Coordinates of C-alpha atoms and ligand atoms in Angstrom, one line a residue:
Chain O
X8 CA 22.9 7.3 -26.7
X9 CA 23.8 3.9 -27.6
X10 CA 25.7 3.2 -24.4
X11 CA 22.7 3.1 -22.1
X12 CA 20.7 0.6 -24.3
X13 CA 23.3 -1.9 -24.6
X14 CA 22.9 -5.2 -23.1
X15 CA 25.8 -6.8 -20.7
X16 CA 27.0 -9.1 -23.2
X17 CA 27.0 -6.4 -26.2
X18 CA 29.0 -4.1 -23.6
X19 CA 31.6 -6.8 -23.1
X20 CA 32.2 -7.7 -26.6
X21 CA 32.2 -3.7 -27.4
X22 CA 35.1 -3.5 -24.8
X23 CA 37.0 -6.5 -25.9
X24 CA 36.9 -5.4 -29.6
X25 CA 38.4 -2.0 -28.7
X26 CA 41.3 -3.3 -26.8
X27 CA 44.5 -1.6 -28.2
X28 CA 47.5 -3.7 -29.4
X29 CA 50.5 -4.7 -27.3
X30 CA 53.1 -2.5 -28.7
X31 CA 57.0 -3.5 -28.4
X32 CA 59.8 -1.6 -27.0
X33 CA 62.9 -0.5 -28.9
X34 CA 65.8 -3.2 -29.1
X35 CA 68.7 -0.7 -29.8
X36 CA 72.2 -2.8 -28.9
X37 CA 73.9 0.6 -29.3
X38 CA 72.1 2.1 -26.2
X39 CA 74.0 1.4 -23.0
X40 CA 72.6 0.0 -19.7
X41 CA 71.8 3.1 -17.9
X42 CA 69.0 5.2 -16.1
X43 CA 68.4 7.5 -18.9
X44 CA 68.5 5.0 -21.5
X45 CA 65.9 2.8 -19.4
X46 CA 63.8 6.1 -18.9
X47 CA 64.0 6.8 -22.5
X48 CA 62.7 3.1 -23.5
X49 CA 59.9 3.5 -21.3
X50 CA 58.9 7.0 -22.3
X51 CA 59.2 5.9 -25.9
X52 CA 56.9 2.9 -25.0
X53 CA 54.2 5.1 -23.3
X54 CA 54.2 7.9 -25.9
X55 CA 53.0 5.2 -28.6
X56 CA 50.8 3.6 -26.1
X57 CA 48.9 6.8 -25.6
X58 CA 48.2 7.2 -29.3
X59 CA 46.1 4.0 -29.2
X60 CA 44.5 4.7 -25.7
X61 CA 42.9 7.8 -27.5
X62 CA 41.5 5.5 -30.1
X63 CA 40.3 3.0 -27.4
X64 CA 38.9 5.8 -25.1
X65 CA 36.8 6.9 -28.2
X66 CA 35.4 3.4 -28.3
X67 CA 34.4 3.1 -24.7
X68 CA 30.6 3.4 -24.5
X69 CA 29.4 7.0 -23.2
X70 CA 32.8 8.6 -23.8
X71 CA 31.7 10.2 -27.5
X72 CA 28.7 11.7 -25.9
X73 CA 30.8 13.9 -23.5
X74 CA 32.1 17.3 -24.6
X75 CA 35.5 17.4 -26.0
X76 CA 36.5 19.3 -22.9
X77 CA 35.7 16.6 -20.6
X78 CA 37.1 13.9 -22.7
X79 CA 40.4 15.8 -22.6
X80 CA 39.8 16.2 -19.0
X81 CA 39.3 12.3 -18.2
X82 CA 42.4 11.1 -20.3
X83 CA 44.7 13.5 -18.6
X84 CA 43.6 12.4 -15.3
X85 CA 43.4 8.6 -16.0
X86 CA 46.2 8.3 -18.6
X87 CA 48.9 6.9 -16.3
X88 CA 46.1 4.5 -14.3
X89 CA 45.3 3.0 -17.6
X90 CA 48.9 2.3 -18.7
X91 CA 49.7 1.0 -15.3
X92 CA 46.6 -1.5 -15.2
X93 CA 47.5 -2.5 -18.6
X94 CA 50.8 -3.5 -17.6
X95 CA 49.4 -5.2 -14.6
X96 CA 47.2 -7.2 -16.6
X97 CA 50.0 -8.4 -19.1
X98 CA 52.2 -9.3 -16.2
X99 CA 49.6 -11.5 -14.3
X100 CA 51.2 -14.9 -15.8
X101 CA 54.9 -13.6 -15.2
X102 CA 55.2 -13.8 -11.5
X103 CA 58.0 -11.5 -10.0
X104 CA 58.3 -9.7 -13.3
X105 CA 56.7 -6.9 -15.5
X106 CA 55.9 -7.3 -18.9
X107 CA 56.4 -3.8 -20.3
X108 CA 56.5 -5.5 -23.8
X109 CA 56.9 -9.0 -25.3
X110 CA 60.5 -7.8 -25.5
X111 CA 60.9 -6.0 -22.3
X112 CA 60.2 -8.2 -19.3
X113 CA 61.8 -6.7 -16.0
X114 CA 62.2 -7.8 -12.6
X115 CA 62.5 -5.7 -9.4
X116 CA 66.2 -6.1 -9.5
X117 CA 66.5 -4.3 -13.2
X118 CA 63.9 -1.7 -11.5
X119 CA 66.6 -0.5 -9.4
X120 CA 68.3 1.2 -12.5
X121 CA 66.2 4.5 -12.1
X122 CA 66.1 6.0 -8.6
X123 CA 62.7 5.6 -6.9
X124 CA 61.0 3.4 -9.3
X125 CA 61.8 0.2 -7.2
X126 CA 58.9 1.3 -4.9
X127 CA 56.5 1.6 -7.8
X128 CA 57.6 -1.6 -9.2
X129 CA 57.0 -3.3 -6.1
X130 CA 53.4 -1.9 -5.8
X131 CA 52.8 -2.8 -9.6
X132 CA 54.1 -6.4 -8.9
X133 CA 51.6 -6.8 -5.7
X134 CA 49.0 -5.6 -8.0
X135 CA 49.9 -8.1 -10.4
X136 CA 50.0 -10.7 -8.1
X137 CA 46.6 -10.0 -6.5
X138 CA 45.2 -10.2 -9.9
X139 CA 46.6 -13.6 -10.5
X140 CA 45.2 -15.0 -7.3
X141 CA 41.8 -13.6 -7.9
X142 CA 42.1 -15.3 -11.3
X143 CA 40.9 -12.0 -13.0
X144 CA 39.3 -12.4 -16.4
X145 CA 39.9 -10.3 -19.4
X146 CA 36.0 -9.4 -19.5
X147 CA 36.6 -7.9 -16.0
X148 CA 39.6 -6.5 -17.0
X149 CA 38.3 -4.3 -19.8
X150 CA 35.5 -3.6 -17.4
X151 CA 37.8 -2.2 -14.6
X152 CA 39.8 0.0 -17.4
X153 CA 36.7 1.6 -18.8
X154 CA 35.8 2.4 -14.9
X155 CA 39.2 4.2 -14.5
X156 CA 38.6 6.1 -17.5
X157 CA 35.2 7.5 -16.4
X158 CA 35.7 7.7 -12.8
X159 CA 39.3 9.2 -12.2
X160 CA 38.2 12.8 -13.2
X161 CA 34.7 13.0 -12.5
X162 CA 35.0 14.7 -9.3
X163 CA 37.4 17.3 -10.3
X164 CA 35.7 18.9 -13.4
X173 CA 23.6 16.9 -16.8
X174 CA 26.9 15.4 -17.7
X175 CA 28.0 14.1 -14.5
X176 CA 25.1 11.8 -14.2
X177 CA 25.3 10.5 -17.8
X178 CA 28.8 9.1 -16.4
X179 CA 27.5 7.9 -13.5
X180 CA 24.6 6.2 -15.7
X181 CA 27.1 4.5 -17.8
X182 CA 29.4 3.5 -14.5
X183 CA 26.2 1.8 -13.2
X184 CA 25.8 -0.2 -16.4
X185 CA 29.4 -1.2 -16.3
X186 CA 28.7 -2.4 -12.8
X187 CA 25.6 -4.5 -14.1
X188 CA 28.0 -5.9 -16.7
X189 CA 30.7 -7.0 -13.8
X190 CA 28.0 -8.8 -11.8
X191 CA 26.4 -10.2 -15.0
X192 CA 29.9 -12.0 -15.7
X193 CA 30.3 -13.1 -12.2
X194 CA 26.7 -14.5 -11.9
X195 CA 27.6 -16.1 -15.5
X196 CA 30.6 -18.0 -14.0
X197 CA 28.2 -19.7 -11.3
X198 CA 29.4 -17.2 -8.5
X199 CA 26.8 -16.8 -5.7
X200 CA 25.3 -13.5 -4.9
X201 CA 27.5 -13.2 -1.9
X202 CA 30.5 -13.9 -4.0
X203 CA 29.4 -11.6 -6.8
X204 CA 29.3 -8.8 -4.1
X205 CA 32.5 -9.7 -2.5
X206 CA 34.4 -10.1 -5.6
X207 CA 33.2 -6.6 -7.1
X208 CA 34.4 -5.0 -3.8
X209 CA 37.6 -6.7 -4.1
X210 CA 38.3 -5.6 -7.7
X211 CA 36.9 -1.8 -7.1
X212 CA 39.1 -1.5 -3.9
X213 CA 42.3 -2.4 -6.2
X214 CA 41.5 0.8 -8.1
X215 CA 42.3 2.8 -5.0
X216 CA 45.8 1.3 -5.1
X217 CA 46.1 2.0 -8.9
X218 CA 45.1 5.6 -8.3
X219 CA 48.0 5.4 -5.5
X220 CA 50.4 4.1 -7.7
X221 CA 49.7 6.8 -10.5
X222 CA 49.9 9.7 -8.1
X223 CA 53.0 8.4 -7.0
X224 CA 54.4 8.2 -10.8
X225 CA 53.2 11.6 -11.3
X226 CA 55.4 12.8 -8.6
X227 CA 58.7 11.6 -10.1
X228 CA 57.8 12.4 -13.7
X229 CA 57.0 15.9 -12.6
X230 CA 60.7 15.9 -11.2
Chain H
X3 CA 46.6 20.6 -27.4
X4 CA 47.8 17.4 -29.1
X5 CA 45.2 15.7 -27.0
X6 CA 42.6 18.0 -28.8
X7 CA 43.8 17.1 -32.0
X8 CA 43.8 13.4 -31.6
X9 CA 40.5 13.4 -30.2
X10 CA 39.2 15.5 -33.3
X11 CA 41.1 13.1 -35.8
Chain Q
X8 CA 39.5 -14.2 14.7
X9 CA 36.5 -12.8 16.6
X10 CA 35.6 -10.4 13.7
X11 CA 34.8 -13.2 11.3
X12 CA 32.2 -14.5 13.5
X13 CA 30.2 -11.3 14.0
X14 CA 26.8 -10.7 12.5
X15 CA 26.1 -7.8 10.2
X16 CA 24.2 -6.0 12.9
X17 CA 27.1 -6.7 15.4
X18 CA 29.4 -5.2 13.2
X19 CA 27.5 -2.1 12.5
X20 CA 26.8 -1.7 16.5
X21 CA 30.5 -2.1 17.1
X22 CA 31.6 0.4 14.6
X23 CA 29.1 2.9 15.7
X24 CA 30.2 2.4 19.2
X25 CA 33.8 3.0 18.3
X26 CA 33.0 6.4 16.7
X27 CA 35.3 9.1 17.7
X28 CA 34.2 12.3 19.2
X29 CA 34.0 15.8 17.2
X30 CA 36.7 17.9 18.4
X31 CA 36.8 21.9 18.8
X32 CA 39.4 24.1 17.3
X33 CA 41.4 26.4 19.7
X34 CA 39.4 29.8 18.8
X35 CA 42.0 32.2 20.0
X39 CA 44.8 37.4 13.2
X40 CA 44.0 36.1 10.0
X41 CA 46.9 34.1 8.4
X42 CA 48.0 31.4 6.4
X43 CA 50.2 30.4 9.3
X44 CA 47.3 31.2 12.0
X45 CA 45.0 28.8 9.7
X46 CA 47.4 26.0 9.3
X47 CA 48.4 25.9 12.8
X48 CA 44.7 25.7 13.9
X49 CA 44.3 22.7 11.5
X50 CA 47.7 21.1 12.5
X51 CA 46.4 21.4 16.2
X52 CA 43.0 20.0 15.3
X53 CA 44.3 17.0 13.4
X54 CA 47.0 16.3 16.0
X55 CA 44.3 15.8 18.8
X56 CA 42.1 13.8 16.1
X57 CA 45.0 11.5 15.5
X58 CA 45.1 10.3 19.2
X59 CA 41.3 9.6 19.1
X60 CA 42.1 8.0 15.6
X61 CA 44.5 5.5 17.4
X62 CA 41.6 4.5 19.9
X63 CA 39.1 4.0 17.3
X64 CA 41.0 1.6 15.0
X65 CA 42.0 -0.5 17.8
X66 CA 38.1 -1.2 18.2
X67 CA 37.7 -1.8 14.5
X68 CA 37.1 -5.6 14.5
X69 CA 40.2 -7.6 12.9
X70 CA 42.4 -4.8 13.8
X71 CA 44.0 -6.2 17.1
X72 CA 44.6 -9.7 15.5
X73 CA 47.3 -7.8 13.4
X74 CA 50.9 -7.6 14.5
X75 CA 52.0 -4.5 16.0
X76 CA 54.2 -3.4 12.9
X77 CA 51.1 -4.1 10.6
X78 CA 48.9 -1.7 12.9
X79 CA 51.4 0.9 12.6
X80 CA 51.7 0.3 8.8
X81 CA 47.9 0.6 7.9
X82 CA 47.7 3.7 10.2
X83 CA 50.5 5.7 8.8
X84 CA 48.9 4.9 5.3
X85 CA 45.5 5.8 5.9
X86 CA 45.5 8.5 8.6
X87 CA 44.8 11.4 6.1
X88 CA 42.3 9.7 4.4
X89 CA 40.3 8.9 7.7
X90 CA 40.7 12.4 8.6
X91 CA 39.4 13.5 5.2
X92 CA 36.3 11.1 5.1
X93 CA 35.4 12.2 8.6
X94 CA 35.5 15.8 7.6
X95 CA 33.5 15.1 4.3
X96 CA 30.9 13.3 6.5
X97 CA 30.7 16.1 9.2
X98 CA 30.3 18.6 6.1
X99 CA 27.4 16.6 4.4
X100 CA 24.5 19.1 5.7
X101 CA 26.5 22.0 5.4
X102 CA 26.7 22.4 1.4
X103 CA 29.4 24.6 0.0
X104 CA 31.2 24.6 3.4
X105 CA 33.9 22.2 5.4
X106 CA 33.1 21.6 9.0
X107 CA 36.5 21.0 10.5
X108 CA 34.8 21.7 13.8
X109 CA 31.8 23.0 15.1
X110 CA 33.2 26.5 15.6
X111 CA 35.5 26.2 12.4
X112 CA 33.1 26.1 9.5
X113 CA 34.8 27.5 6.5
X114 CA 33.8 27.7 2.9
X115 CA 35.8 27.6 -0.4
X116 CA 36.5 31.3 -0.4
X117 CA 38.0 31.3 3.1
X118 CA 40.1 28.1 2.1
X119 CA 41.9 30.5 -0.3
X120 CA 43.8 31.9 2.6
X121 CA 46.3 29.0 2.2
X122 CA 48.2 28.5 -1.1
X123 CA 47.1 25.4 -3.0
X124 CA 44.6 24.3 -0.4
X125 CA 41.6 25.6 -2.5
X126 CA 42.2 22.9 -4.9
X127 CA 42.0 20.2 -2.2
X128 CA 39.1 22.2 -0.7
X129 CA 37.4 22.0 -4.0
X130 CA 37.9 18.1 -4.0
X131 CA 36.5 17.7 -0.6
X132 CA 33.5 19.9 -1.2
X133 CA 32.8 17.7 -4.1
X134 CA 33.1 14.8 -2.4
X135 CA 30.9 16.0 0.3
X136 CA 28.3 17.0 -2.1
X137 CA 28.4 13.6 -3.6
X138 CA 27.7 11.9 -0.1
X139 CA 24.9 14.2 0.3
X140 CA 23.0 13.3 -2.9
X141 CA 23.4 9.6 -2.2
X142 CA 21.9 10.1 1.1
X143 CA 24.9 8.2 2.8
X144 CA 24.0 6.7 6.0
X145 CA 25.9 6.7 9.2
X146 CA 26.0 2.9 9.1
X147 CA 27.5 3.1 5.5
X148 CA 29.9 5.6 6.7
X149 CA 31.7 3.8 9.5
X150 CA 31.5 0.8 7.1
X151 CA 33.7 2.9 4.3
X152 CA 36.1 4.4 7.0
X153 CA 37.0 0.9 8.5
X154 CA 37.4 -0.5 4.7
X155 CA 39.9 2.7 4.1
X156 CA 42.0 1.5 7.3
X157 CA 42.5 -2.0 6.2
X158 CA 42.9 -1.5 2.6
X159 CA 45.1 1.7 2.1
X160 CA 48.4 -0.4 3.2
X161 CA 47.6 -3.8 2.5
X162 CA 49.4 -3.8 -0.7
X163 CA 52.7 -2.2 0.7
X175 CA 46.9 -10.8 4.4
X176 CA 44.3 -13.3 4.1
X177 CA 43.0 -12.2 7.4
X178 CA 42.5 -8.4 6.2
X179 CA 41.0 -9.5 3.2
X180 CA 38.5 -11.9 5.0
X181 CA 37.6 -9.2 7.2
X182 CA 37.1 -6.6 4.2
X183 CA 34.9 -9.5 2.7
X184 CA 32.5 -9.3 5.9
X185 CA 32.4 -5.4 5.7
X186 CA 31.3 -5.9 2.1
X187 CA 28.6 -8.2 3.4
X188 CA 27.7 -5.8 5.9
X189 CA 26.9 -2.8 3.5
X190 CA 24.9 -5.1 1.2
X191 CA 23.2 -6.2 4.3
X192 CA 22.3 -2.8 5.3
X193 CA 21.3 -1.9 1.6
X194 CA 18.9 -5.0 1.3
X195 CA 17.2 -4.2 4.7
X196 CA 16.6 -0.5 3.5
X197 CA 14.6 -2.0 0.7
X198 CA 16.9 -1.7 -2.3
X199 CA 16.8 -4.2 -5.0
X200 CA 19.5 -6.6 -5.9
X201 CA 20.6 -4.2 -8.8
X202 CA 20.3 -1.1 -6.5
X203 CA 22.8 -2.9 -4.0
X204 CA 25.6 -3.5 -6.5
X205 CA 25.3 -0.2 -7.9
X206 CA 25.4 1.7 -4.7
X207 CA 28.0 -0.7 -3.5
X208 CA 30.1 0.2 -6.5
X209 CA 29.4 4.1 -6.3
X210 CA 30.6 4.2 -2.6
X211 CA 33.8 2.2 -3.4
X212 CA 34.7 4.3 -6.3
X213 CA 34.4 7.3 -4.2
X214 CA 37.3 5.7 -1.9
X215 CA 39.5 6.4 -5.0
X216 CA 39.1 10.0 -5.0
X217 CA 39.6 10.2 -1.3
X218 CA 43.0 8.1 -1.7
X219 CA 43.6 10.8 -4.6
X220 CA 42.8 13.6 -2.2
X221 CA 45.2 12.5 0.6
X222 CA 48.2 12.0 -1.9
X223 CA 47.8 15.5 -2.7
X224 CA 47.6 16.7 1.0
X225 CA 50.7 14.7 1.7
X226 CA 52.7 16.2 -1.2
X227 CA 52.0 19.8 0.6
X228 CA 52.6 18.5 4.1
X229 CA 56.1 17.2 2.8
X230 CA 56.7 20.5 1.1
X231 CA 55.3 22.7 4.3
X232 CA 57.9 20.6 6.4
Chain Y
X4 CA 55.3 7.3 19.1
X5 CA 52.9 5.4 17.0
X6 CA 54.0 2.2 19.0
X7 CA 53.2 3.7 22.4
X8 CA 49.8 4.7 21.6
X9 CA 49.0 1.3 20.2
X10 CA 50.8 -0.6 22.9
Ligands
LIG1 C1 64.7 -6.6 -23.4 C2 65.6 -6.0 -23.5 C3 67.0 -5.9 -23.0 C4 67.7 -5.0 -23.3 C5 67.5 -3.7 -23.9 C6 68.2 -2.8 -24.2 C7 69.5 -2.7 -24.7 C8 70.4 -3.6 -25.1 C9 69.8 -4.5 -26.1 C10 70.6 -5.4 -26.5 C11 72.2 -5.3 -26.4 O1 72.7 -6.3 -26.9 C12 72.7 -4.5 -25.6 C13 71.6 -3.7 -25.0 C14 69.9 -1.2 -24.4 C15 70.2 -1.1 -22.7 C16 68.7 -1.5 -22.3 S1 68.0 0.0 -21.1 O2 69.0 0.4 -20.3 O3 67.6 1.1 -21.8 O4 66.8 -0.4 -20.2 C17 66.9 -1.7 -20.0 C18 66.5 -2.8 -20.9 C19 66.5 -4.3 -20.4 C20 67.0 -4.5 -19.2 C21 67.5 -3.4 -18.5 CL1 68.0 -3.7 -16.9 C22 67.5 -2.0 -18.9 C23 68.0 -1.6 -23.4 O5 68.7 -0.6 -24.4 C24 66.1 -3.7 -24.4 C25 65.5 -4.6 -24.6
LIG2 C1 70.2 -7.4 -15.9 C2 71.3 -7.3 -16.5 C3 71.6 -5.9 -16.7 C4 72.8 -5.6 -17.2 C5 73.6 -6.3 -17.8 C6 74.6 -6.1 -18.2 C7 75.5 -5.2 -18.1 C8 75.3 -4.2 -17.2 C9 74.5 -4.4 -16.1 C10 74.5 -3.4 -15.3 C11 75.0 -2.4 -15.2 O1 74.8 -1.5 -14.3 C12 75.9 -1.9 -16.5 C13 76.0 -3.0 -17.3 C14 76.6 -5.4 -19.0 C15 75.9 -5.1 -20.6 C16 74.8 -6.2 -20.6 S1 75.0 -7.7 -21.9 O2 75.0 -7.5 -23.2 O3 76.4 -8.3 -21.7 O4 74.3 -8.9 -21.5 C17 72.7 -8.5 -22.0 C18 72.6 -8.5 -23.5 C19 71.5 -8.4 -24.1 C20 70.3 -8.2 -23.1 C21 70.6 -8.3 -21.8 CL1 69.2 -8.0 -20.9 C22 71.9 -8.4 -21.3 C23 75.2 -7.0 -19.4 O5 76.5 -6.7 -19.4 C24 73.0 -7.6 -17.6 C25 71.9 -8.1 -17.0
LIG3 C1 56.7 8.7 -19.7 C2 56.6 7.6 -18.9 C3 55.4 7.3 -18.6 C4 55.1 5.9 -17.8 C5 56.5 5.2 -17.4 C6 56.5 4.3 -16.6 C7 55.9 3.1 -16.5 C8 55.1 2.6 -17.6 C9 55.4 2.7 -19.0 C10 54.4 2.2 -20.0 C11 53.3 1.3 -19.5 O1 52.7 0.8 -20.5 C12 53.4 1.1 -18.4 C13 53.8 1.5 -17.3 C14 55.9 2.4 -15.3 C15 55.3 3.0 -14.4 C16 55.9 4.4 -14.4 S1 56.8 4.8 -12.6 O2 55.7 5.4 -11.9 O3 57.4 3.9 -12.2 O4 57.5 6.0 -13.1 C17 58.7 6.3 -12.3 C18 57.0 4.1 -15.4 O5 57.2 2.9 -15.1 C19 57.6 5.7 -17.7 C20 57.6 6.9 -18.2
LIG4 C1 48.6 18.0 10.3 C2 47.3 18.3 9.4 C3 46.7 17.3 9.0 C4 45.5 17.6 8.1 C5 45.3 18.9 7.7 C6 44.4 19.0 6.9 C7 42.8 19.0 6.8 C8 42.3 18.3 7.7 C9 42.6 18.2 9.2 C10 41.8 17.7 10.2 C11 40.6 16.9 9.7 O1 39.8 16.6 10.7 C12 40.3 17.0 8.4 C13 41.0 17.6 7.6 C14 42.6 19.3 5.6 C15 42.9 18.2 4.5 C16 44.5 18.5 4.6 S1 45.1 19.4 2.8 O2 45.1 18.5 1.9 O3 44.3 20.8 2.6 O4 46.7 19.7 3.2 C17 47.2 20.8 2.6 C18 46.7 21.1 1.4 C19 47.2 22.4 0.8 C20 48.2 23.2 1.5 C21 48.7 22.7 2.7 CL1 49.7 23.7 3.5 C22 48.0 21.7 3.2 C23 44.5 19.7 5.5 O5 43.3 20.2 5.6 C24 46.1 19.9 8.1 C25 47.1 19.6 9.1

């Protein structure tokens, strides 16, 4: 295993290099402004993101050591969470708006076009505003996104301990970044807790989104 | 599963 | 706010002091309706005690009445679940809903769709047992659930959440854990709260469907 | 109901 032997700096650069591209949405002026057209735009965008997310997951340290069967299970549990934390991260510098794509920036008013999506839109906007208040860094973001991949399906499956050892190293990486930025030990502990508690809200948003998709 | 094939390819 | 002026030991003793009692089930056929009724009756009596305990959670009285209603209606099933998971720690393979209602995975199949949430609850309890989750850590996590489950749907709540974090680290440093072991265990415990949120959301779907 | 128990 190469994951358990990486340093903190090598872990960050590895995750940064695996970052998937920022895709564009379709810009079809022949399509009307309707709910089904909006849900078709978001569905088309998410499907193309999923293909890049699978390659990105292969490059997350420790994910290759898993069995194929497990990899399928982690991705099918966390895929909407990973899409959501990516969207939330892209939307940090656009207050009151969600940057689904550079050519698809939506506020909560436009989110009313689909029934029930406005509540999830507000939750995503609040999560984005919280990241902006905390001044979330990209190195911290790729750490949180790798935690989601390894943690979302670990309690619903020798292997579970390996995932937990990789998770401990990502925790060592988050603290290493915070101590590097000049934070005191108490501030390192507090910021670590603040970030991981946001993952509970991202899990909540994903579970609510799965309900509407299954409908 | 396509998730199988994409993880093998 | 008086909560922010407490020491770590005073925060621990205050949370341990506010612990609600462990109630009993009615104990009166074998049915999914008989089983769902016993759990509904039990959870309804736990809720009343749960409305007393958050009142004693430091920083909760400072919130407005509407905000207190919001946090409780967001986290009530989570708080019930982490309490059940905590009671079941020393009973591997079984969920201790009550001292007179100890059920295993097999008996959970008596209700449709509960065996899945049953397995998740068992897996959470086994994880707490292998970490040697302490009672002082448990009451800190349960307070975090209350103040965090509805906070994004506020500086005071976040400053109380920071002090609870200082309390967990204080407990770990006192038990002899190294600095690296302190932030790893902190991360391990808080990541479990994501699964408890997951189990709550799955539980709410069946309740909204049972109704 | 929840307000009365909190009040
Ligand atoms: C940005 C952006 C804005 C509109 C579109 C869409 C359409 C469009 C583009 C140019 C036009 O001259 C006329 C329409 C159509 C309709 C929208 S949508 O209903 O599918 O979703 C959207 C897209 C943008 C805004 C809203 Cl509200 C809904 C999208 O497809 C796509 C991206
Ligand atoms: C936001 C927003 C949403 C829709 C519109 C427009 C229309 C519309 C809005 C809501 C509906 O329920 C139905 C239609 C229509 C068509 C579009 S537009 O082409 O005139 O303006 C554009 C053209 C290109 C992109 C956008 Cl976002 C609006 C605009 O008027 C404008 C802004
Ligand atoms: C399919 C499909 C998947 C996700 C979405 C949604 C979003 C999304 C799409 C791509 C991203 O990169 C990020 C997010 C967002 C959130 C979901 S939802 O929960 O609001 O669905 C309703 C939906 O809107 C829509 C359709
Ligand atoms: C009311 C009411 C509240 C919670 C429960 C449940 C549980 C519980 C009750 C008291 C506790 O101290 C701890 C847990 C557990 C967890 C929920 S559930 O997720 O199993 O709810 C389901 C899950 C699947 C099917 C049905 Cl009908 C309910 C239910 O069983 C049942 C009824």
